[PDB]
Design a protein around this ligand. Structure first.
Ligand code: FAD
Ligand code: FAD
Ligand code: NA
Ligand code: NA
Ligand code: ZN
Ligand code: ZN
Ligand code: ZN
Ligand code: ZN
Ligand code: ZN
Ligand code: ZN
Ligand code: ZN
Ligand code: ZN
Lengths: 112, 112
């Protein structure tokens, strides 16, 4: 029960972000589309890893969140995460698997 | 690497929320105060535990986030969490300890 470090906070943050994405509507209202884009922007203002937050705001200044549908947003966010992975020398996550990882469980049923 | 369940997602969500609070400014601008209140409201719209999110929106409809300073917000959020703890038959967290838990580490140095 110590304050989470960069690694622990980062993992939990992605878990939160990818989970919210995984359950976002397939057919969001215009308000939901605006709200979710604003949510990601606000996260970028307050994420307390200052280097991380700066990096993120830079990225979002060009690459605005795609919140048009669940499919779009889950893909958008998976790609954003892979950009961070690449910076940190981590492998790309296969974005075609984003639903298995964050909603449905692996196809082999190992999460059932 | 399975989709987090209610318990795992909840723990990580509180970790994220209390950490953002712990590092929020002592002297936030009016824009930061509005932004952080909006951030909490948006979280309440998208948190995918539907019972949880409903519960939260109900609470926030009366008890709006206090984002006036770091001290206020960390306390506000600790109290909000304790309301949820109480519903779930968990003990109250001592809010006077919120900085030890989420920023500084325990006074005994066990986190150093
Ligand atoms: C917006 C943001 C920005 C950050 N910027 C920085 C930074 O600039 N510098 C820095 O050092 N750290 C940064 N971090 C923290 C960093 O990205 C990691 O969270 C941290 O290094 C821990 O890495 P990890 O290997 O445990 O797994 P993480 O990258 O935390 O991934 C957690 C899990 O998510 C899954 N996953 C991995 N990639 C993807 C993907 N593309 N899509 C969907 N799921 C995936 C995997 O199952 C993985 O185990 C940032 C975090 C966030 C949320
Ligand atoms: C906004 C929100 C709402 C939720 N609503 C529900 C709900 O209606 N029903 C439901 O079943 N679950 C709900 N959850 C999930 C639930 O609150 C817990 O996260 C989950 O049951 C796991 O509990 P836990 O005992 O692991 O610790 P959590 O309550 O997840 O706490 C994690 C850690 O935070 C620290 N902590 C505990 N209390 C406080 C506090 N008051 N202030 C600061 N730090 C604290 C402790 O170190 C604790 O180990 C909600 C979560 C959130 C974020
Ligand atoms: Na660590
Ligand atoms: Na569990
Ligand atoms: Zn690292
Ligand atoms: Zn943790
Ligand atoms: Zn699109
Ligand atoms: Zn790219
Ligand atoms: Zn529970
Ligand atoms: Zn986890
Ligand atoms: Zn106040
Ligand atoms: Zn109360």
């Amino acid at each position: 029960d110590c304050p989470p470090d960069r690694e622990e906070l980062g993992r939990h943050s992605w878990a939160v972000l990818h989970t919210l994405a995984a359950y976002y509507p397939d057919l969001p209202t215009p308000e939901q589309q605006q709200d979710m884009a604003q949510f990601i922007h606000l996260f970028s203002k307050f994420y307390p890893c200052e280097e991380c937050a700066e990096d993120l705001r830079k990225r979002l200044a060009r690459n605005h969140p795609d919140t048009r549908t669940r499919a779009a947003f889950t893909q958008w966010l998976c790609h954003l995460h892979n950009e961070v992975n690449r910076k940190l020398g981590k492998p790309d996550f296969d974005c075609s698997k984003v639903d298995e990882r964050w909603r449905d469980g692996w196809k082999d049923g190992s999460c059932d």
